[PDB]
Amino acid sequence: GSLCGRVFKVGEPTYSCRDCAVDPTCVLCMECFLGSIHRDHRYRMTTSGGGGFCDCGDTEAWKEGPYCQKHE
Numbered sequence: 701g702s703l704c705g706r707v708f709k710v711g712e713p714t715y716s717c718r719d720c721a722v723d724p725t726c727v728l729c730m731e732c733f734l735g736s737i738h739r740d741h742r743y744r745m746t747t748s749g750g751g752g753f754c755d756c757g758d759t760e761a762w763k764e765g766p767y768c769q770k771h772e
């Protein structure tokens with residue numbers, strides 16, 4: 701219920717839950733991933749080359765658990 705929305709900087713890890721992502725571009729930042737249900741799911745970590753943004757709290761990006769503990 702609050703906004704992460706943050707942009708990724710070069711080198712930062714991004715996390716896409718394989719079980720819950722609507723498509724492979726759906727990603728959580730490290731803080732949101734580790735505070736979400738998806739930390740216990742199958743996931744893809746991809747290092748950012750810069751750009752994009754965290755999808756925490758976008759119900760269109762996730763089949764379940766769209767919000768991490770901080771942003772719910």
Ligand SMILES: [Zn+2]
Pocket residue numbers: 704705706728729730731732733754755756
């Ligand atoms: Zn985030």
Ligand SMILES: [Zn+2]
Pocket residue numbers: 704731732756757767768769770771
């Ligand atoms: Zn979050």
Ligand SMILES: [Zn+2]
Pocket residue numbers: 717718719720721737738741765
């Ligand atoms: Zn998941």
